[PDB]
Structure formats: structure tokens, C-alpha cells
Structure 1
Amino acid sequence: KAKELREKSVEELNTELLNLLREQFNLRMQAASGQLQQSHLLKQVRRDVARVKTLLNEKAG
């Protein structure tokens, strides 16, 4: 996953940063709603948005 993204284009990289935060908003709504018994996807998605914003700001320069 950290390696599969370094064959993506920048616009490909950016549209999955949009899907990650929409997933992150989906999970953050679910955790407060009494749902999301799988309370480990939060830490995983938060480090998935960091994984791509790192890969964003490195091919930008």
C-alpha cells in the first residue's frame, strides 16, 4: 500500500486522498453514533492519509 501508490499519477494520488477523508468522515461519524465496533480503522485511515500526503509533497519537488 505504501508501495502500490508510487505508481500512481498525481491526480490519481489526489482523488484517493479525497476518498480517504470521506472514509475518515464516514468512520468518525460511525464511532460517535454508537456503531463502529471495529475501533481500529480510525488509526489505520489516519495513517493512510498521511501516507499519501507524504507521497504528495515529495513528487511536488
Structure 2
Amino acid sequence: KANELREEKSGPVTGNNISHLLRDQFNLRMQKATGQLGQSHLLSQVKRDIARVKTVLNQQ
């Protein structure tokens, strides 16, 4: 959520957090191109989660 992320972590700590779920976005674009992705709810979920951490950085 957003109330979790405003707990301070930092500029760097949340800046490390973005490079984590870009991996999880990458792996879900590889499995979809191949035959093995049933959880289609996961694919439209990390798009709405990268957007949160970019919001809490361009503002504070």
C-alpha cells in the first residue's frame, strides 16, 4: 500500500525496491510469451505497483 511506503524507508531504500519488481515484471512478460501463465491477475498488478513507488519519490 501507500501508507506502508511513506514510513520513511528512504530515497535509497525505496529506490532499491523498484529494481526488485522490475524483475517480477520481466519474468511475467517472459512466461506470457511462452505457454505458461495462468495467473493473469498478477500481470496487471505489478503495473499498478510500480506506479505507487514512482509517486512517493517524485513527491515526498
Mark yes or no: TM-score above 0.5: yes
Cross-structure match for 1:29: 30
1:3 aligned partner, one-letter code: N
Matched, 1:6 2:6: yes
1:52 Cα offset (Å): 0.4
Cross-structure match for 1:50: 51
| Larger RCO: 1 or 2 (CA < 8 Å, sep 6+) | 2
Structure 2: give runs of 5+ residues left out of the alignment.
none
Structure 1: give runs of 5+ residues left out of the alignment.
none
Q: Which runs of 4+ in 1 moved over 6 A?
A: none
1:12 aligned partner, one-letter code: V
Deviation per CA, 1:2-59: give whole Å up to 9, x if none.
2111111111111111111111001111111111100111111001000100111002
Q: TM-score, normalised by structure 1?
A: 0.87
Identity %: 64
How many corresponding residue pairs? 59
Q: TM-score, normalised by structure 2?
A: 0.89
